[PDB]
Design a protein around this ligand. Structure first.
Ligand SMILES: [Mg+2]
Length: 563
């Protein structure tokens, strides 16, 4: 069937859309080539619509059915709980999109009578009506990027599709426990969202070293959400139904599957009918779990079709990396083509054709790659890094324009050991918080799709527990990483590293001048900036903070707020 059908009504914005950095940047200090930065808007919606609209032809074989049965047997060990209205309400982010029924996220979190009474009626309606498609809103997503190195090369807006707030709270009641527990039960160590960055690199490095002769590849499915078929979504449900479930949870899942997950009408921000979806909606609770299960099922079956040997996969939503035993350069390239042909039959054709890779450091998955540096004792440390271009572009945007979600904080947390996060991101934002005395103020950021409210003065503890003490002492970065960063700073017009070393000293000195958590930030976060390096010992606070559910599951698109 067609992934989408369109009526002609436009994807419209809800308010003014900004597409460029403000006229005189609030921090030309970070980035000088302001014209390189842009944000996507609804103006490019039709370009995205063209890419994402096509007929899916899916052919399932015995390998697919075999793997599905294996997955179901593991799912059948799961017992899932229904969430109470109160528990589900508390998972709603404070700035979640308001309901058309006259209440908003604040009312949901406060358990207001209007909100709670509507949510209860939405729940009963899932039991009373098993078929009527549930309405969804379609919008163009606002995301900031740096322009392609081809003069005028811009990505079009992604299209987000989500149901009303009342429905989203009902999804949590029925499915939050399922999507939080089932993927690991089914996929075991292949489930990527159970790992912190440090644990992910460890799993990757250990997997690499376990092969007599390792070969690895990432597989990029073209527009994964659009490739998800009605069959795939019902197969996903068939896995959920293997859980022990409350009767109303079973029904809610059955109704949500047929009324929302498999497809439905698309309404624009003006309330006009835009058309019809028959693929994955980006903005429902099951999107991350569903994509991960579907990708894992198709890829695992595809490895079997391709006769890849000793495959170990790591799956994060639509992101896939596999490491296996090599059969020779020639036989690998052939196997990889067979794998791609199998994935294509399963309705997951590639964007960029995959390439066998015989150096772990050259594989990028989840936009990231493994690289190597050295700690104080000169011991080899592996860490995850990425090209810093998008993080820096978004940092510049967030410095110049007010933003609800602070991607720079998420990046500092997730990439704390990197050369660019330590020298640029940390230096830049700590100077800003220092100047405005906003240091103590908690900020919103996302980790694996879930929203968290985090105090920047807690970064030392967070980083140590997540990445290890070596995150504060890494030196001797790889030539490839140094050159990638240098090239990035050239392109964006970011001042040279040596310069950041200077600003850092000033910041470090000011932080120490304050004492307390501020002083701890000075000592640990900026020890790279001095030669007379303060000896760094494990912080007392590291081990005694609530980092429980930070790396349990993926929640991208699921409207989840943690703590
Ligand atoms: Mg893809």
């Amino acid at each position: 069937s067609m992934s989408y059908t369109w009526t002609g009504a436009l994807i419209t914005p809800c308010a003014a859309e900004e597409s460029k950095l403000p006229i005189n940047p609030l921090s030309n200090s970070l980035l000088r080539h302001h014209n390189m930065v842009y944000a996507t808007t609804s103006r490019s919606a039709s370009l995205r619509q063209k890419k994402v609209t096509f007929d899916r032809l899916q052919v399932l074989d015995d390998h697919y059915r075999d793997v599905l049965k294996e997955m179901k047997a593991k799912a059948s060990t799961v017992k899932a709980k229904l969430l109470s209205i109160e528990e589900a309400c508390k998972l709603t982010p404070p700035h979640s999109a308001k309901s058309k029924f006259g209440y908003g996220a604040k009312d949901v979190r406060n358990l207001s009578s209007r909100a709670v009474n509507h949510i209860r009626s939405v729940w009963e309606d899932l039991l009373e009506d098993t078929e009527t498609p549930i309405d969804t809103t379609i919008m163009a997503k606002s995301e900031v990027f740096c322009v392609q190195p081809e003069k005028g090369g811009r990505k079009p807006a992604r299209l987000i599709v989500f149901p009303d707030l009342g429905v989203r709270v009902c999804e949590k009641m029925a499915l939050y426990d399922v999507v939080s527990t089932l993927p690991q039960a089914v996929m075991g160590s292949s489930y990527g969202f159970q790992y912190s960055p440090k644990q992910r690199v460890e799993f990757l490095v250990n997997t690499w070293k376990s092969k007599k002769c390792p070969m690895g590849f990432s597989y990029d499915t073209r527009c994964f959400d659009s490739t998800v078929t009605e069959s795939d979504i019902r197969v996903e449900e068939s896995i959920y139904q293997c859980c022990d479930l409350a009767p109303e949870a079973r029904q809610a899942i059955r109704s949500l599957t047929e009324r929302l997950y498999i497809g439905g009408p698309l309404t624009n921000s003006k309330g006009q009918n835009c058309g019809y979806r028959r693929c994955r909606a980006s903005g429902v609770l099951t999107t991350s779990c569903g994509n991960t299960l579907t990708c894992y099922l198709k890829a695992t079956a595809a490895c079997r079709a391709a006769k890849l040997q000793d495959c170990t996969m790591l799956v994060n939503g639509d992101d896939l990396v596999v490491i296996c035993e090599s059969a020779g350069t020639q036989e690998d390239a052939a196997a990889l083509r067979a794998f791609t042909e199998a994935m294509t039959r399963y309705s997951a054709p590639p964007g960029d054709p995959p390439q066998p890779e015989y150096d772990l450091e050259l594989i990028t998955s989840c936009s990231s790659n493994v690289s190597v540096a050295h700690d104080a004792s000169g011991k080899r440390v592996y860490y995850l890094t990425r090209d810093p271009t998008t993080p820096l572009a978004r940092a510049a945007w967030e410095t110049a324009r007010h933003t609800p979600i602070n991607s720079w904080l998420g990046n500092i947390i997730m990439y704390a050991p990197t050369l660019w996060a330590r020298m640029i991101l940390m230096t830049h934002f700590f100077s800003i918080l220092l100047a405005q005395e906003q240091l103590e103020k908690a900020l919103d950021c996302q980790i694996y799709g879930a929203c968290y409210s985090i105090e920047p003065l807690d970064l030392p503890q967070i980083i140590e527990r997540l990445h290890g003490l070596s995150a504060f002492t890494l030196h001797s970065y790889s030539p490839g990483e140094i050159n990638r960063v240098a090239s990035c700073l050239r392109k964006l017009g970011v001042p040279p590293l040596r310069t950041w070393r200077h600003r850092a000293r000033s910041v470090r000195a000011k932080l120490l001048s304050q004492g307390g958590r501020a002083a701890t930030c000075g000592r640990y976060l900026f020890n790279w900036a001095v030669r007379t390096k303060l000896k760094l010992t494990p912080i007392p606070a590291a081990s005694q903070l609530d980092l429980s559910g930070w790396f349990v599951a993926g929640y991208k698109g699921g409207d989840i707020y943690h703590s």
